[model samples]
Target: HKVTKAHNGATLTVAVGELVEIQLPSNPTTGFAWYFEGGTKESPNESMFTVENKYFPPDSKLLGAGGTEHFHVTVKAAGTHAVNLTYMRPWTGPSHDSERFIVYLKAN
Candidate 1:
């Protein structure tokens, strides 16, 4: 997927074993960066941390919530390492915080 920031609110989708390189308008270097503060409930047969430095066990069940059994995604994802820390914060039906923000790259 190579979508621009236009579809920010849309639940961006990607296939297992494929590369995802979506574009974003906000740059982390500029200050605030994008983060995945939620989880995909759909269980996957394959997946990625989307952007983790060390090879993390990408099973969603490891979080005791969403479960992606065994998938591979060589996602050249941007955002920062905050991602590893970001996913730790699953939402409890929290409203979208900022006015112009949306998460991306949901897989199933």
Candidate 2:
């Protein structure tokens, strides 16, 4: 149960309708946050993805501390190619992606 970087753009083989989750590192303190978008490629995940943040049990509860983030995806249907997770700083232009996590769901 060990994974690491360089594991981006992974194709996950699953049943028709399955669910998946991912965790990421973040530093919203610097206005840096993680977000999602989609495309129809072997690389990247479903566009219809949602996310939540867990910034607790760290330091300075009132302030935004550097920590890890989580990404959860729901696959209710099938064959809907999509999903790119990007870490961005607004105003840096949409084309500029500091770092991104891409995944794909290959349903059979």
Candidate 3:
């Protein structure tokens, strides 16, 4: 689901064991965060963690318009997963927000 750049962007759907490629928008050098949403509570911030172990690519920073990152998603098991790709705007008056990409799934 390429959910960036739009408001509450597109929805991605898949079955268990399905593999999908997610192209995410580039993030500015100021840095950003990654979040996993399930049910009512969202997963905590993962920026401070050590070592490299994630679905998305390492150094998955934002590139220019022609630049983007990808996520190789496989339905590991039967469950519902929602992921977000967000960019924190610089200068921080409020935030230059972009649309988010979400994935909805069901097991076969």
Candidate 4:
């Protein structure tokens, strides 16, 4: 099953080899995007799962429309993992109020 931004702070379960899809709201028109901080295959939890993200524009062709950011993650080992991300412009650096999303998962 797929999870949404509302699942944040929630702990979910999944099979070791299952792939989890997480979708969150995003609006690139504001020069902000979602980054899978510390959630990549190169991160410390590489042994647990791999994380990748992509963006899709709104169905309408109208400009300046908001869309969803999709995170495709795959569980690799039997353990718990924390998926984290930050919404910000890469060049602006991070600040205290920057948007963030996190979800916990246990892979059996």
Arranged by TM-score with the best first, the candidates are: 4, 2, 3, 1
Tell me how far the alpha carbon of residue 83 in candidate 1 is from the true structure, in angstroms, after superposition. Answer: 11
Per-model TM-score on C-alpha atoms: 0.35, 0.63, 0.45, 0.86
Per candidate, the number of residue pairs that clash is: 4, 4, 5, 0
Q: Write the per-residue lDDT of candidate 3 for residues 33-60, one digit (tens) a residue.
A: 3333321112332221111213343353
* Per-residue alpha-carbon lDDT of candidate 2 for residues 1-108, written as tens digits (9 for 90 to 100): 111235587777655545565566668787665665432112233344333334322455556666666555555456643446677665452365368776675655
Every model's Cα RMSD, please?
Answer: 13.2, 5.5, 7.9, 2.3
- Rank the candidate models, highest lDDT first: 4, 2, 3, 1
What's the C-alpha lDDT at position 12 in model 3? 50
1-108: candidate 1 lDDT, tens digit per residue: 544345445555654434544344332222333334444422221234343222223344234232211212243333221111122223332345642334355544
Is candidate 1 or 3 superior in lDDT? 3
lDDT for residue 106 in candidate 4, whole number 0-100: 89
> How much lDDT does each candidate structure score?
0.34, 0.53, 0.40, 0.77
lDDT of prediction 4: 0.77
**After superposition, which runs of candidate 2 have C-alpha atoms over 4 Å from their true positions?**
1-6, 38-65, 91-93
Please estimate how well model 3 matches the true structure, expressed as its whole-model Cα lDDT.
Answer: 0.40
Off by over 4 Å in 4: 38-44
